[PDB]
Symmetry: D2
Subunit: 115 residues, 4 copies
């Protein structure tokens, strides 16, 4: 898969498990079209969101439902979600890992783009 999402929990020092992630592709009319989604695994990872064929150049938004995560942990979060918006560009580097490190009032996102 050319796209992987990895979410870490900076409060618990753990993968952020069962975090809903939605991926959207910007449509011609500048709207976000749902493209894929999943929940992060026990390892805080979400694999298999897309395929090389499907994951064409375009602007993608990865929306990480951080709020539900924090709500599940009983911790007041600031953000509604973490939205990572990027242009996928052909095609090297090929693989995108979108890693998000979550704190209740802060998140960081990083892209590890590799071949």
């Amino acid at each position: 898969c050319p796209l992987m999402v990895k979410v870490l929990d900076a409060v618990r020092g753990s993968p952020a498990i069962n975090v809903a992630v939605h991926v959207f592709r910007k449509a011609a009319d500048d709207t976000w079209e749902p493209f894929a989604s999943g929940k992060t695994s026990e390892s805080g990872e979400l694999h298999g969101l897309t395929t090389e064929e499907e994951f064409v150049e375009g602007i993608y938004k990865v929306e990480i439902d951080t709020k539900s995560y924090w709500k599940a942990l009983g911790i007041s979060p600031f953000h509604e979600h973490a939205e990572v918006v990027f242009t996928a560009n052909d095609s090297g580097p090929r693989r995108y890992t979108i890693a998000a490190l979550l704190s209740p009032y802060s998140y960081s996102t990083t892209a590890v783009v590799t071949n």
Copy 2:
């Protein structure tokens, strides 16, 4: 004023100056209405976006044009922008500083939320 956006450049170790910031507020119809915009100053701060009166409860989106910022520095960054989406003032008015720390392939955003 209750909403300040601060943008720092993690490559240069500097404020991120002249960064366009667009603030949107989720409307009743669940669309993003333009709320305010500006650009960061030499201090990487953007003040005066709104007022206590205008900054009512709502879901706000602060979209920081990090791409233009990096592009102006010759960098093709990963992100189109840094988007900070949050419910504001739901427990009464607060002063929000939305700080973004930018790197070409990473950004972090933090909110420092204090009482008026």
Copy 3:
């Protein structure tokens, strides 16, 4: 003054108040000499650590006692502290803001380095 330490709490979205900060400067004998210390104020800032005259070129270590901070909040954090080690003023005097953003198992530190 040329060295400021700012500490933010990423859990609370607040300044990290009363955080002990110890600054050391690498001596000629390559040991860490105590340089300055203080604690962050209500704004999570620690000012007045040093002066232009005293803050000469050197390798400085800012050790932020994040553990005591979290522990006081009932949290057993991962890190003993956040340690920021850097060469200062090597291209002439600069004003350094060392910002740390703290979470129990993570911290980030940034330097905003500006001219006097």
Copy 4:
């Protein structure tokens, strides 16, 4: 291995490869004793630093030579290194991933502590 170090490069959006990492254990006299070291792999990872047997409770310092990394990339860095200092506590969670995300003037470190 109970300890893994992972280093990412926030400028290039890549693993931070060939980054020297030194691990130290605080000795009884409060000095740092070198314990282990390595360079991060192509994946920005450093495995096999220690073993469960050797990695007893104590205060450890992971010193990531970020400066040499940035120097190799021709980018002026701020920090001499990134030092992650933590108490290893028995023994759950067992495995420590010390992840560092590097920028020239900023780094973040996170511990992902799992079983």
